[PDB]
Amino acid sequence: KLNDLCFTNVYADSFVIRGDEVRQIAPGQTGKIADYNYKLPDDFTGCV
Amino acid sequence: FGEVFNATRFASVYAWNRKRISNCVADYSVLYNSTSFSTFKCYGVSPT
Ligand SMILES: *[C@@H]1O[C@H](CO)[C@@H](O)[C@H](O)[C@H]1NC(C)=O
Ligand SMILES: *[C@@H]1O[C@H](CO)[C@@H](O)[C@H](O)[C@H]1NC(C)=O
């Protein structure tokens, strides 16, 4: 549906991590990235 | 966590190993610097 929509309050976040840690960029995750570095909301709209 | 995740020799999958754990605090934040995991998935409980 991305091609048929209009988007409000768009932001882009950028960083670099280790390959093993990519699974932690998701709602409700644990680990050091998801605890001390970068946290997503439980109710998240957007793409990773 | 040190003789489970940091053992010198692991078993073969056909004769897999089983170990009892009791009477200990489960503070896993000690593995944040120790051990990078490509897979970590929990069933019946939320990681948070
Ligand atoms: C993490 O582990 C590395 C490699 O052993 C070590 O150099 C570093 O000091 C450790 N960091 C701390 C303080 O936990
Ligand atoms: C695992 O054991 C090795 C053996 O010397 C040690 O160098 C390493 O620091 C240990 N890693 C831990 C305890 O996280």
Swiss-Prot record, chain A:
Biological source species: Severe acute respiratory syndrome coronavirus 2 (2019-nCoV)
Annotated spans, Integrin-binding motif: 18-20
Quaternary structure and interacting proteins, as annotated: Binds to host ACE2. RBD also interacts with the N-linked glycan on 'Asn-90' of ACE2. Cleavage of S generates a polybasic C-terminal sequence on S1 that binds to host Neuropilin-1 (NRP1) and Neuropilin-2 (NRP2) receptors. Interacts with host integrin alpha-5/beta-1 (ITGA5:ITGB1) and with ACE2 in complex with integrin alpha-5/beta-1 (ITGA5:ITGB1). May interact via cytoplasmic c-terminus with M protein. May interact (via N-terminus) with host bilirubin and biliverdin, thereby preventing antibody binding to the SARS-CoV-2 spike NTD via an allosteric mechanism.
UniProt superkingdom: Viruses
Summary of the function given for this chain in its UniProt record: Attaches the virion to the cell membrane by interacting with host receptor, initiating the infection. The major receptor is host ACE2. When S2/S2' has been cleaved, binding to the receptor triggers direct fusion at the cell membrane. When S2/S2' has not been cleaved, binding to the receptor results in internalization of the virus by endocytosis using host TFRC and GRM2 and leading to fusion of the virion membrane with the host endosomal membrane. Alternatively, may use NRP1/NRP2 and integrin as entry receptors.
Protein name in UniProt: Spike protein S1
Lineage of the species this protein comes from: Viruses, Riboviria, Orthornavirae, Pisuviricota, Pisoniviricetes
Swiss-Prot record, chain B:
Gene that specifies this protein: S
Effect upon mutating G2H: In strain: Omicron/BA.2.75, Omicron/XBB.1.5, Omicron/EG.5.1
Outcome of substituting L31I: In strain: Omicron/XBB.1.5, Omicron/EG.5.1
Residue positions with a glycan: N6
Designated name of the protein: Spike protein S1
Annotated organism of origin: Severe acute respiratory syndrome coronavirus 2 (2019-nCoV)
Domain of life of the source: Viruses
Function of the molecule: Attaches the virion to the cell membrane by interacting with host receptor, initiating the infection. The major receptor is host ACE2. When S2/S2' has been cleaved, binding to the receptor triggers direct fusion at the cell membrane. When S2/S2' has not been cleaved, binding to the receptor results in internalization of the virus by endocytosis using host TFRC and GRM2 and leading to fusion of the virion membrane with the host endosomal membrane. Alternatively, may use NRP1/NRP2 and integrin as entry receptors.
Phenotype upon changing S34L: In strain: Omicron/BA.1
Effect ascribed to mutating R9T: In strain: Omicron/BQ.1.1, Omicron/XBB.1.5, Omicron/EG.5.1
Quaternary structure, from the entry: Binds to host ACE2. RBD also interacts with the N-linked glycan on 'Asn-90' of ACE2. Cleavage of S generates a polybasic C-terminal sequence on S1 that binds to host Neuropilin-1 (NRP1) and Neuropilin-2 (NRP2) receptors. Interacts with host integrin alpha-5/beta-1 (ITGA5:ITGB1) and with ACE2 in complex with integrin alpha-5/beta-1 (ITGA5:ITGB1). May interact via cytoplasmic c-terminus with M protein. May interact (via N-terminus) with host bilirubin and biliverdin, thereby preventing antibody binding to the SARS-CoV-2 spike NTD via an allosteric mechanism.
